[PDB]
Design an enzyme around this catalytic site. Structure first.
Site, short mmCIF file in Angstrom:
data_model
loop_
_atom_site.label_atom_id
_atom_site.label_comp_id
_atom_site.label_asym_id
_atom_site.label_seq_id
_atom_site.Cartn_x
_atom_site.Cartn_y
_atom_site.Cartn_z
N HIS A 41 0.96 -1.25 -0.07
CA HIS A 41 -0.03 0.05 0.05
C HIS A 41 0.93 1.27 -0.10
O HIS A 41 0.25 2.31 0.06
CB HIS A 41 -1.07 0.06 1.20
CG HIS A 41 -0.62 0.27 2.45
ND1 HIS A 41 -0.35 -0.91 3.62
CD2 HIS A 41 0.21 1.21 3.12
CE1 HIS A 41 -0.04 -0.38 4.57
NE2 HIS A 41 0.50 0.94 4.49
N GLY A 143 3.19 6.21 9.76
CA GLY A 143 4.42 5.81 9.25
C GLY A 143 5.25 4.52 9.79
O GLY A 143 6.30 4.48 9.30
N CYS A 145 4.20 1.52 9.04
CA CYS A 145 4.04 0.38 8.14
C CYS A 145 5.33 -0.07 7.63
O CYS A 145 6.34 0.81 7.32
CB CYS A 145 3.04 0.83 7.13
SG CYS A 145 1.51 1.43 7.98
#
EC number: 3.4.19.12
Lengths: 306, 306
Positions: A41, A143, A145
């Site tokens: 993503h 942030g 991820c």
């Protein structure tokens, strides 16, 4: 002596963290050999995340659209591919700090260390358990991820988790390093049921053994029980059913302490039915289920790594 | 979101751990520039530790009696000196992995990360608080002496603790990196009173603020209080007295949540007098005092290092 929730030393993983940027989105990536792994993503805008068609979105990207920064060093991206829910960016440089490593899919109830990262930079390290419902209860801000979870076996890092999502309930979901989600979750900003969680019974028992080893023994009782009788109690209290395999895994702790596993089960039964009466065990006022039997043995034998 | 007891990334400290052997005794040392720091009781036999004369024992040692192993690499020892309770071994090689660093003496109530080590090899990392009575509640088995505690400020490691002793009560004592014990303790195997400990009030309040930030707000009450009225309650429950300096340090969390510090004190007062009624806060059934206000702000702002 003493017993702490201890994470693995994180240095081998620190050297693999990079920043990945695609358009407006920046998150963390994991740089091993000449491949960088990150959540797919990274290619989504905020609006994309409501209902993304990852194949169509990825078709609009080229190698030069992925900016990968290793501190100040840089990887030229020479290929990209999507594997399930992860992006694999081929870079022209092998990470000189690549540790010996494996990719592992862990089982519910197993534990691992998370290196929380922002913008490719390590923030902190903590130990987690994969819940029976395949969520983790972490500390992940925007942030984070692409942060990863791992175990160490002497010199070899087994990566088992990459962070993707915070569910609307505030718990956390992610994938193995082949991009397969743990649990039923998808990488879409929508309501997602985690489903009923349960307590990891074999881990609670391991921690009771750790308590006895360290001198906390007030909960040791007078009774014993049977596997089926205890499991009747486990079900009432939303504990995982205890199997013979679990009993076998607790064998060495049983042998060290001289407390038969079924006797410890009867102590745990009394704790479930009567509570803890305002007492504590290893400094906790709850029954702790984030230590595996292997975790307890390692901490009470001082196994080291590098 | 979410809130975890998080340790600093340990890689910068991992590269400084060495093994120190003197006679029969092996423990850990810290290799910075061309100096290795370790507990001076590395020179003691088991019987020496009952009543050691460190000056006389050290006089019987020469440079070649200290074996310092950095993994497989080696330091030739070219000088040795005793500074308070630490030994300083001058070696002929500067540690190529020396991070930017400072030696700091921390205050009671402050927190730090411990890298537990055996035979110079890192075992795990966890976050501690220095208790008001200058003990720490760690996880330290035999051979863990010389393990260090530290904080990171972007690229700079502030070392604050070196492990020396387990008291007969099972709690842990140690020194700063100039060898001065925290607290009244000495490096002798004898009975040593730690004295009454207290709960770190400003840390509990910081953690209540962290709970509110993460949505745990059931404990928010209807009342307010005064500094003196709350401190009357703090004393009954063996909590540290809250000062204006503490109130000032909680200022930014007060401003973010819109909850005046004295209102949070009245919530804490009600929790102390009434307990938690079988509820939990941030997953704990006890009031937690191992997060400083700086810890909470860092975790709820995602500060990174390297």
């Amino acid at each position: 002596s003493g017993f702490r929730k201890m994470a693995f030393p994180s240095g081998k993983v620190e050297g693999c963290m990079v920043q990945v940027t695609c358009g407006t989105t920046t998150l963390n990536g994991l740089w091993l050999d000449d491949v960088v792994y990150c959540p797919r993503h990274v290619i989504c805008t905020s609006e994309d995340m409501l209902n993304p068609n990852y194949e169509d979105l990825l078709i609009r990207k080229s190698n030069h659209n992925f900016l990968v920064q290793a501190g100040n060093v840089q990887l030229r991206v020479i290929g990209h591919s999507m594997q399930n829910c992860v992006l694999k960016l081929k870079v022209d440089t092998a990470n000189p700090k690549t540790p010996k490593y494996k990719f592992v899919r862990i089982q519910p109830g197993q534990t691992f260390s998370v290196l929380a990262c922002y913008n490719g930079s390590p923030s902190g390290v903590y130990q987690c358990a994969m819940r029976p419902n395949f969520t983790i209860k972490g500390s992940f801000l925007n942030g984070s991820c692409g942060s990863v979870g791992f175990n160490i076996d002497y010199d070899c890092v087994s990566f088992c988790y990459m962070h993707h999502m915070e569910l609307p309930t505030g718990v956390h979901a992610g994938t193995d390093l082949e991009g397969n989600f743990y649990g039923p979750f998808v990488d879409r900003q929508t309501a997602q049921a985690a489903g009923t969680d349960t307590t990891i019974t074999v881990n609670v028992l391991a921690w009771l053994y750790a308590a006895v080893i360290n001198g906390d023994r007030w909960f040791l009782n007078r009774f014993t029980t049977t596997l089926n009788d205890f499991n009747l109690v486990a079900m009432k209290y939303n504990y995982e059913p205890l199997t013979q395999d679990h009993v076998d895994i607790l064998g060495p702790l049983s042998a060290q302490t001289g407390i038969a596993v079924l006797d410890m089960c009867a102590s745990l039964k009394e704790l479930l039915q009567n509570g803890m009466n305002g007492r504590t065990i290893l400094g906790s006022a709850l029954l702790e289920d984030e230590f595996t039997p292997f975790d307890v043995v390692r901490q009470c034998s001082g196994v080291t790594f590098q």
